[PDB]
Amino acid sequence: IQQLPMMKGMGKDFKNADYIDYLPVNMLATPKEILNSSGYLRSFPGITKRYDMNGVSRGVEYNTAQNAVYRVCGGKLYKGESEVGDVAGSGRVSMAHGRTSQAVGVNGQLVEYRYDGTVKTVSNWPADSGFTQYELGSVRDITRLRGRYAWSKDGTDSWFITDLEDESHPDRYSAQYRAESQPDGIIGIGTWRDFIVCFGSSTIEYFSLTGATTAGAALYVAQPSLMVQKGIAGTYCKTPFADSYAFISHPATGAPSVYIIGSGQASPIATASIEKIIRSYTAEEMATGVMETLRFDSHELLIIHLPRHVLVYDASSSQNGPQWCVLKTGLYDDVYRGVDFMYEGNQITCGDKSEAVVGQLQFDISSQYDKQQEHLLFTPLFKADNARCFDLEVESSTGVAQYADRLFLSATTDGINYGREQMIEQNEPFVYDKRVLWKRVGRIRRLIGFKLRVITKSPVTLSGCQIRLE
Amino acid sequence: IQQLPMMKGMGKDFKNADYIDYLPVNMLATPKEILNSSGYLRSFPGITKRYDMNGVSRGVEYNTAQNAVYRVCGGKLYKGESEVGDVAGSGRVSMAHGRTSQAVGVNGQLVEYRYDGTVKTVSNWPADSGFTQYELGSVRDITRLRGRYAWSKDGTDSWFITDLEDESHPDRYSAQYRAESQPDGIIGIGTWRDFIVCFGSSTIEYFSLTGATTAGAALYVAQPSLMVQKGIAGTYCKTPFADSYAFISHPATGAPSVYIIGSGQASPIATASIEKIIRSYTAEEMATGVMETLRFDSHELLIIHLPRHVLVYDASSSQNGPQWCVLKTGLYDDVYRGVDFMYEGNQITCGDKSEAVVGQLQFDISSQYDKQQEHLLFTPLFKADNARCFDLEVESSTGVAQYADRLFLSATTDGINYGREQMIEQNEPFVYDKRVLWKRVGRIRRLIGFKLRVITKSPVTLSGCQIRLE
Amino acid sequence: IQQLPMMKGMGKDFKNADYIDYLPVNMLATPKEILNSSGYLRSFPGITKRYDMNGVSRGVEYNTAQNAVYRVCGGKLYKGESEVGDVAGSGRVSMAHGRTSQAVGVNGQLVEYRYDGTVKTVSNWPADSGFTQYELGSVRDITRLRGRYAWSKDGTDSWFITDLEDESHPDRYSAQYRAESQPDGIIGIGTWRDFIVCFGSSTIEYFSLTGATTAGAALYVAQPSLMVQKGIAGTYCKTPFADSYAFISHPATGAPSVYIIGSGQASPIATASIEKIIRSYTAEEMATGVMETLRFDSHELLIIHLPRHVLVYDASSSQNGPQWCVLKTGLYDDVYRGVDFMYEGNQITCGDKSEAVVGQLQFDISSQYDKQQEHLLFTPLFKADNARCFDLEVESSTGVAQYADRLFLSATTDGINYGREQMIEQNEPFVYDKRVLWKRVGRIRRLIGFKLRVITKSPVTLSGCQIRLE
Amino acid sequence: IQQLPMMKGMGKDFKNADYIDYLPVNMLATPKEILNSSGYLRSFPGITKRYDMNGVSRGVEYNTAQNAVYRVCGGKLYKGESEVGDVAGSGRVSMAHGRTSQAVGVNGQLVEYRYDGTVKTVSNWPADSGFTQYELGSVRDITRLRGRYAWSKDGTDSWFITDLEDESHPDRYSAQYRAESQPDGIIGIGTWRDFIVCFGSSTIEYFSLTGATTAGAALYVAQPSLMVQKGIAGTYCKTPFADSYAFISHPATGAPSVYIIGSGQASPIATASIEKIIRSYTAEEMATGVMETLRFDSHELLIIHLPRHVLVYDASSSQNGPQWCVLKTGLYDDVYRGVDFMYEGNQITCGDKSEAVVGQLQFDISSQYDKQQEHLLFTPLFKADNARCFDLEVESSTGVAQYADRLFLSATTDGINYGREQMIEQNEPFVYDKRVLWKRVGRIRRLIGFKLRVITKSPVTLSGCQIRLE
């Protein structure tokens, strides 16, 4: 009796005869110390329609000052279900809320909405007042530390600041700040534990405020002990993850790869196969990749929305090596649906990247809206000669289905292309005890590996595959 | 011969066919290196009525200046047994004693009683005196560091302080301080090792006093090295535990979960099943969750009084993984009775949440007041095929009972619903040596798990369940 | 059944009968947890022509201010494909970009190329201005920290600096800095985390800038806690590797050897056989050795372009001891083709040293341009007496070839010279499953070692050699 | 089958019946993971004459300012092969180069030569100038930090310094510095990472320069955290090694022994037998012991030139315990030939101590000049009763010899005096595969130990001695 792990499956690709492992499609990994194994695999939760909105999502941020979720969701702003304002422009926006403003920052101007009901835009002080009158530019990203905002001019080292008393003007005396570590544009900006993180193309630098008590004297001073020496590939390739940012490396460095910021250095978390997938996209296509973080139950996910891949990293389940996963909607290869996830109340609300709708995650159903989904599992290739496998017994938990869904399994002799697909039912609507197995698998000549296609709209749980090897 | 652990039992739920473990209800876990196993399970101590009071318990605090226990317990304040004052308002109060006051802080005002016999209320300085005249608001929580009080204005960043010479006024010159790292109202306040801990909705900030020796010059300065970056779900979800506060995460963060503050970060202490239970409550219903701490013998408990669950965490018994427990009063599902545990003299004085009475814990009886209690134990599911179990022999300690109570045991084949209940007596009033066992259990087809219902009003001790597997 | 590792093979040389190991020629090492072994060996990617340029490569640098790759590549400068200026001089050049000019620094003068379209040169301030008028000399290397350049004069301790406003003049008041623990010329200069690293002949010293706010008062102050106490052999024997520089030791110390800078000391990374190869060159020949860093997939390679050796160090694959490799072009011994590797877009663009052409790396082809290449693998010597080896079966992955290429294997009895070469086909153009093995190897008298010559222009993968020893 | 190590052999001496181990004379130890054992033993490289010089070697120092090796070598100074100056006096000199001088420091005055062609001597400032006019004394050792020299007055605590502008005078205002922790003369001086190390008879002190910017105000201040509390036995018994100096303890401390300086303390590196050898010399005779450092291939050797012993310590090969070795020239007991080893170009240039000649090391020959050499190996004593050893087979590498040299082996029964010498040829001029073994060794009564005399002028390699024990 041998046990075949399915938490990650090895294989090879026909393009250049290289060994690349097949990530488990559309199913997560949980360690739970199951009956005879250690850990069970559960399908991703299913999406159900909640509200109808103007368009495809373009941004989200959980306002802390007011207990509500803000999202532009296409044509115009939304607070939960309410309308509360209009935003102009198509693309993706970066939001940073405030005590008395929202600061959507669409297009190249720092548009900030007010809780009173008025709309304002950040611009230079009036010439009649008699202030410094800086030279502002286009805006890319937004943040907020203490009581003021901070944006970065497009394609230039300098990033500006926001005044305290009047929040719609740069400042009275001192607002011009520069990175100056290496010559590089500011790809993005962010905040981390009272530090203003400056995401450059090649470097990352931390700024800490100091007590000036003087007119125009260096409110923020750059800290050089915490430099990372690596950049970010795109504007939105950064998230708050664990206590770090977990960016994606820029093409300026050796090669694009996922990372995680340490104390003063970046530690990789992406396997070679993941970087092989990342390298498939050109430089321009890489810059349009969104990143997020999601935490439900004991999981801590890190989702990367690449143009054709929705790779997902599970931090808790990566006990021995990284655990990556890929998500897709259609039966064939397609991009996942639902871009911005955010925890509202006691539910998780997702957006949508193609349809003008918003939906919530549901745990007892595995269908996105009202369409069935494909789930895949891959067993790593094994080299056994002249053996005969008979009892392949995967163990499932059943009883939350609406139809007796079936399972397709197949075997590879060369590791690239599969044989016939055998049809076994793996779920029954109200049977809580049943056995899923295949009685005869036959001789294996040189090497064999398995596949476990499942097409359902009900939760799928599989844990522990064993075969009687002789 | 196989030994079956009972400290925690695995299972699955019928709603979504997920593997959730069954916590052992109403009995603690103690490691003591027993005859043949390591650890024994003992029932929770039973409540007995001590005094009759005005109403349902609403607060408790062990006054240190005077060796006595204060509790409002409904209609009016109480010091031990005496009346000593009246408090108005229904709900829950936050209590913080003083050298010359008690500061119940009911409703939205800091009502503070005096040992002399007079009642005062914190209010602005008289306009005739000529002081700074702050603008106070509603009060949520109270604390005391050095000779000063500290309260937080409701729904706003700012938290105030109390003057030294006249402790019924904010201060002479400098009393308004604010959090400000992020825009978030102060959910709660507390003290920890000369630091005034500021519990925000999204962040946690530590304030340390400095020597001013000046008129209105920053008595307290915020320390930014000790930020936690996580909020608290409700007003009363915090409790000094060990050397930290052990809060509950806010919905603003990815998902609600229990935590413990470290040096500068929070470390989770809740299993996935515990967070699944916590997510069952809506956001508004979660804010009414009280937490406490209790320490008797070698135990160190952390009790969470959710609306429908009384989850208990045992710090000392969590050698390999967390050890959570749930308490309930009725034979069916119900919430535990007795809110506030405080150690007075050599006894523990529990409150009440459904009747106008106060009671003390007793160790040699397992009945709350004069009613019997239910105790359950779940054995984790095992996968053995075609085997037969014969001798299931749990080992109990007897001789402190009033009647020969019986024990109900049953088995599951699918892990959800149980079979027939077999009745075995597990205790005899004055017999110190007897066996508790069942001679035949029969074949197990695929998998089996057990249950050990006990209904007594006498102490229940069980340690070590073994079955002759073949 | 025994398994023979091929990642590194031991042997001896006929010159002085010493045990020197044979590094795997032109094949990398990757740990991947292959079917029955741990790791597989894959050929280096092949070069394909991309552009036609003026001459052999002479320098490269990835401009960060403008997203493009700059390379002189012979007669005149190039930005990607465009001409954009002319450069004078033959040899090797040191490049350091800027935020207004490029800078090439040929001969002994800092020729800089401004983007506007003009060319400038660093020279003393005009005498009419009235400044300090330093005494400049011949330049060796260039770098840039903050908004200013920094160069070192030829054969002297002192290294100068560049003015802020005008970057074509040394400075207004303070530009003379000198190294000077020990009397040594500055072989090279470089930057590392806001420190201007001064590479001397015998020591390495770190300079950190300080806030002057004064006329000519010590802009840069030397830090003595970070001195390394070892020099660099040549001008270009330094790269940014990991977080350190990984130089080559100077003959001033005991013997030349590769190193890596630590916190305050150098840690060797070269085996004894590598230092034997390094010592083969005279002092003058070693000074013309280039070094680089390249990172594709999970690799982190350090390439040394010695006059007759192209040694490569793979950091990721060196789990147990250093993993060195050597590359060569012709069927006989010859130096590798392709000087400078840089990552542009999503491809890697290699230079050249014998032709006026530039090329890009391709992964599915193993031929440089359109000529076949040699790959070698050596098995370490084993001492087995009177045994008989029969089933020598190496495991390849096939199906991406253009012709049924064959493999040559042979055995040594004395460890110096090889026996007959047996031809076995190891790859078929479109067959994905086949066995590569030899059925009879015969008796071994005292000791034996194998060889796996392959000549292909298609990817070569071999992983795991097993022989039936009896 | 048993394997007998030869890296170090145990025995006893007839003088006092104490167990002393026999160090392997004239052959090094290298760990390389050989066919069946871990490590092989290779003979020391042979000396060959390169140049003819004036007389016996007296000093050496690798000038860094000019890429050339300086050595007095008896009658008059030498730069490489050129004459370039004359030095008077017989004995040993302490050499410390400079940016514009060489500072041989012979006899009692700091004789310093100049690159221009003139000779100067350190002496007091002229009385007409009007300076502080110190009282200099005899000089023992020389060093150089920054632009200053530093010498020590003979028999006194004080050590002086050298002026910057005119380096042939003590200083303008402040040059008198002193040790003073304990009353002890300065035996020697040295530099280490910007610290002027002061080697006393009983203590060691580190001096760090400070910014004076004042007339005669404490240029150097003594650091007391880095005291070692141990002296050095002789003037030249110290040497930069690794990152420390590795001195020899003074007779003032409990006993003479070798050491290595740590962070703030000395750690011994000498076995008991080595200290037994060191104690054989009287106090006066020990003061004439020279020490050096040499690094070729992976070795890092520390050579001590005692009057009758040439003990050598190998740092890299001391995996389990220290690895000491002894070198000798003649067939009988004699002192090694060649004092000063320095790495010039790609070769090592050894000195001489008995003839007026200088020579270079050569790796493929084992003869010093043109005379054969003796090599010994001792196997540690084993206690086996009534056993019989038959097949003693050492494994050698051959084929670089000029004649079929023979090997002498013998056995001890009491561990002091040896039996008959059996002659086996161990090398053949051009045979790369041969076996060296003895077929019968006979019964061993109580205990036995072996010996492996080899007399050749060709490289000797032996690795792995095994005997069939019964």
Distance CA B207, CA B152 (A): 14
Hey, are the CB atoms on C255 and D343 less than 8 Å from each other?
A: yes
Looking at this protein, which amino acid is placed at residue C344?
Answer: E
Beta strands in D146-203 (DSSP E): 148-153, 158-159, 177-178, 186-192, 195-200
> Residue D270 in contact with residue D328, Cβ under 8 Å?
no
- Measured distance CA(B305)–CA(B336) in Å, rounded: 8
C179 in Cβ contact with C205 (< 8 Å) = yes
Q: Contact B258/B313 with Cβ under 8 angstroms?
A: yes
DSSP category for residue D378: B
Local structure of residue C245 (DSSP, 8 states): -
> How far apart (Å, rounded) are the C-alpha atoms in residues A188 and A203?
11
Of the candidates C338, C330, C287, which has an alpha carbon nearest to the alpha carbon of residue C312? C338
How far apart, in whole angstroms, are the C-alpha atoms of residue B230 and residue B249?
A: 7
Strand locations in A203-262, DSSP E?
204-209, 220-223, 259-261
**Which whole-number Å values give the CA distances from B213 to B161, B165, B174, B210, D256, in the listed order?**
17, 16, 12, 9, 63
Angle at CA of residue C116, ends C110 and C118, nearest 5°:
45
SS3 C61: strand
Tell me how far apart the alpha carbons of residues A329 and A337 are, in angstroms, rounded to a whole number: 7
Task: Tell me which residue of B408, B412, B373 sits closest to B394, measured CA to CA.
Answer: B408
Identity of the amino acid at B95: M
Tally Cβ neighbours within 10 Å of residue A356. 14
Phi then psi dihedrals of residue C279, to 5 deg: -65, -15
Torsion sign over Cα A170, A171, A172, A178? negative
Structure tokens at B170: 């904010």
Strand A461-467 to strand A392-396: parallel, antiparallel, or no bridges (unpaired)? antiparallel
CA A100 to chain C, closest CA, distance in angstroms equals 37
B221 reaches A (C-beta below 8 A): no
User: Which residue, D399, D334, D343, D408, is CA-closest to D368?
Assistant: D334
Candidates A329, A286, A288, A336; CA nearest to A312 is: A336
Test mutation, B14, B15, B182, chain A, max A CBs within 10 A: B182
Three-state DSSP class for D389? Answer: strand
Ranges of H-type helices in B249-388: 272-278, 283-286
Q: Report the alpha-carbon distance of residue D283 to residue D66 in Å, rounded.
A: 39
Q: Say how far apart CA B182 and CA A191 lie, in whole Å.
A: 10
Q: Are D402 and D456 in contact (CB under 8 A)?
A: no
Q: Which residues contact C90 (CB under 8 A, 6 or more apart)?
A: C58
Name the nearest CA neighbour of A266 among A224, A208, A350, A203: A203
Q: At residue B98, what is the residue type? A: G
- Rounded to whole angstroms, the Cα distance separating B245 from B325 reads 20
**A116 C-beta neighbours (distance < 10 Å), count:** 7
**Interface C:B, ≥3 CB–CB pairs < 8 Å:** no
**Are residues B325 and B28 in contact, defined by beta-carbon separation less than 8 angstroms?**
yes
| End-to-end Cα, chain B, rounded Å | 8
Rounded to whole angstroms, how far apart are CA atoms C320 and C322?
7
Q: Taking a C-beta distance cutoff of 8 angstroms, is the pair B202, B223 a contact?
A: no
The amino acid at A256:
P
**Are chains C and A touching, using the cut-off of 8 Å on CB pairs and a minimum of 3 such pairs?**
yes
N- to C-terminal Cα separation, chain C: 8
CA–CA distance, C370 with C337 (Å, rounded to integer): 13
Give the nearest chain B residue to A464 (CA atoms).
B383
B382: which DSSP letter? B
What does the alpha-carbon distance between residue C307 and residue D195 come to, in Å, rounded to a whole number?
A: 40
Q: What is the DSSP string of B205-248?
A: EEEEE----STT--SEEEESTT------SSTT----BTTB---B
Q: Residue B316 carries which side chain, given as an amino acid letter?
A: S
Nearest C-alpha of chain A: how many angstroms from B270?
9
Length of chain B: 470
**Which residue in chain A has the smallest CA separation from C428?**
A17
Does C232 contact A at CB distance below 8 Å?
no
Q: How many CA atoms lie within 13 A of B438 on its CB side?
A: 21
Closest CA to B309 of B332, B333, B339: B333
Kindly report the backbone phi and psi dihedral angles of residue C276, in degrees, each rounded to the nearest multiple of 5, phi listed first: -60, -40
With tokens 């470290």, the residue in question is B262
Q: Are D453 and D421 in contact (CB under 8 A)?
A: yes
C-alpha A464/C-alpha A3 separation (Å) is 7
User: What whole-number distance in Å separates Cα of residue B158 and Cα of residue A211?
Assistant: 20
- Chain A nearest CA to C413, separation (Å): 32
- Give the list of residues 6+ apart from residue A378 with CB closer than 8 angstroms, or none: A6, A8, A9, A10, A11, A22, A23, A24, A449, A450, A451, A452
Return the residue matching tokens 């504007």: A235
Q: B304: which strand partners?
A: B291
**Coil/strand/helix, residue A274:** helix
Tokens 């690239």 -> residue: A416
What is chain B's alpha carbon radius of gyration, rounded to the nearest angstrom?
Answer: 26
| Cα–Cα distance for residue pair A186/D123, rounded to 1 Å | 62
Nearest to D399 among C14, C185, C253 (CB): C14
The minimal CB distance from D400 to the residues C17, C272, C413 is found for C17
Q: What is the C-alpha to C-alpha distance for residues B153 and B141, in angstroms, rounded to an integer?
A: 9
Q: Is B283 exposed, middle or buried (0-12, 13-18, 19+ CB in 10 A)?
A: middle
| Cβ contact A283–C65 (<8 Å) | no
In the numeric block, the tokens 């090439």 are attached to: C104
8 A C-beta contact, residue B202 and residue A64: yes
Touch between chain B and chain A: 3 or more Cβ pairs under 8 Å = yes
Q: Which residues pair with C347 in a beta bridge?
A: C344
Strand partners, A133: none
Residue A339: closest CA among A108, A63, A129, A59:
A59
Using the structure block, give the residue that is written with the tokens 């004036």: D54
Reading phi first (left if > 0) and then psi (alpha if -120 to 50, else beta), residue A37 is in: beta
Taking the C-alpha atoms of residue D140 and residue A51, their distance in angstroms, rounded to an integer, is: 92
Of D296, D363, D435, which is closest to C255 when you measure between CB atoms? D296
The CA distance from C14 to D397, in Å, is: 10
Distance CA B28, CA B463 (A): 12
* Chain C: closest CA distance from residue A255 (Å): 6
Q: Minimal Cα distance from C155: which residue of D?
A: D65
C373, C380 Cβ separation under 8 angstroms: no
Phi, psi of C332 (to 5 degrees): -85, -175
A89: left (phi over 0), alpha (psi -120 to 50) or beta: left
- Does residue A384 belong to the interface with chain C, where contact is any CB pair within 8 Å? no
The last residues before gaps in chain D (C-N over 2.5 Å) are none
Give the closest-approach CA distance of C435 to chain A in angstroms.
9
Structure tokens at A215: 């007119």
What CA–CA distance (Å, rounded) separates C285 from C283?
6
According to DSSP, residue A461 is labeled E
Alpha carbon distance C469, C391 (integer Å): 8
Q: Report the side by side order of strands in the sheet with B449-456.
A: B373-375, B449-456, B406-412, B422-425
DSSP strand pairing (A2-4 vs A436-438): unpaired
Chain mean position to CA B411: 32
- Residue C388: its H or E element: strand C387-389
**Torsion sign over Cα B271, B272, B276, B281:** positive
Query: For residues B236 and B245, what is the distance between their CA atoms, to the nearest angstrom?
Result: 11
